[PDB]
Amino acid sequence: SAQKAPKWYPSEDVAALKKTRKAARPQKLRASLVPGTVLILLAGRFRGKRVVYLKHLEDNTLLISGPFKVNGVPLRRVNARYVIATSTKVSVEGVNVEKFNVEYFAKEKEIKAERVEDQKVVDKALIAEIKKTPLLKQYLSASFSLKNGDKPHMLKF
Amino acid sequence: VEPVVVIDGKGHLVGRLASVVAKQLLNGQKIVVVRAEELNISGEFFRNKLKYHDFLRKATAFNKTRGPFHFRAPSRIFYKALRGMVSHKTARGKAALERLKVFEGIPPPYDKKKRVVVPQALRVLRLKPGRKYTTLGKLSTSVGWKYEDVVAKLEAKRKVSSAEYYAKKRAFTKKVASANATAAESDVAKQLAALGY
């Protein structure tokens, strides 16, 4: 032959995995993520956009709204770890929000009419609350950018 | 933090200033040094005149041409102290040194641009009072430099110009104050005040 055949050959039986022990416990957010808190997004498509926190969801994310009619950002998912939690807050008492969950955003282009109509519903309430305080509406439309002489490790936000 | 930093090297101590500049380059900050002839050196004039003469007496015996090169101008004296603190024989070295310009007097592009000082190299700050020291431009004509009077002449001329520039500017900021006043005490004023502004 071209080579003396092996004397062994291992077992082609792919074995099972050991009973792993990693429960999946809930994620407690940091004490600065109160729903209705204005958030600075730091990455992705709407980086720099100032934005209002709506709801923790089960894939650890945050429900964001913009609101759309203020700065163009939709009801959206966002990861806590790419967000500066500012120290301004809007009341979120008038806002439904309980219909929104993971499966809402589920990958099942065009835009559903539901998304569009839900937007207006949630938005108009937030916009209603935003207007009770001056220059908050503008502040939301302006983008955040660090300036010459800003040192993040000092700034309050 | 700035693209270029221009240093009025007046009243500074040669090697300390040299030192900060050599680091500033190696980290990629473009630097121009100006008024290199009003650079200071600790110790009385004679000592440094003597020290320089040592430097002079060093030359390749078989061909003084390839010998250590004794540059006599203040800029060039100062550039020596700097090169000594950079690894100039490597590309990184050369690159750093290409971010540096040194001038005697302050020539035209810079003459109308802000210069800074380097407090940790300021003679007046560092040197103990009473302690004697040396002026570079005076050290230089001492050991051969040819342009001490030509620079002083162009400097006095720049100084006239720069001060009428300043007289006019100071007269303008007066105006904006006496423009301001009206709104210095306005309602918006008070609101800004509430914020540190």
Binding site: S1, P6, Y9 | -
Partner: protein
């Protein structure tokens, strides 16, 4: 088409080229350990060629594995090939260089049939 096997680590991938094989043509690249009394290599001064020692010995569990997943087995004909039937997630075939163009169509065939992998198809391959 192959087993588990952990992430194949290689530890030291460059060749080990005999000292001064880059100096003189007469000195082959094939490794040879420096013996001479002063030699900087044998004495291991900083900044020289590293020498082979058992520390580079590869993981017992991913050793001999080609990137695919299988130890390669030299195969010179059909019967040679057919040793590998049961052990198809473990080995692949390399058709010995000296196998005629016409015979390699056969072994490629039977392999196909048997689900056996071939490391070097495209043999003396037309087109």
């Amino acid at each position: 088409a192959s087993l588990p096997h952990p992430k194949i680590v290689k530890k030291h991938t460059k060749k080990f080229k005999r000292h001064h094989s880059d100096r003189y043509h007469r000195v082959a690249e094939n490794w040879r350990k420096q013996k001479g009394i002063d030699s900087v290599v044998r004495r291991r001064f900083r900044g020289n060629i590293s020498q082979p020692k058992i520390g580079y010995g590869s993981n017992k569990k991913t050793k001999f594995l080609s990137p695919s997943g299988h130890k390669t087995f030299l195969v010179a004909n059909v019967k040679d090939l057919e040793t590998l039937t049961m052990h198809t997630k473990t080995y692949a075939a390399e058709i010995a260089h000296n196998i005629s163009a016409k015979n390699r169509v056969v072994i490629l065939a039977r392999a196909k049939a048997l689900g056996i992998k071939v490391t070097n198809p495209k043999g003396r391959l037309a087109l």
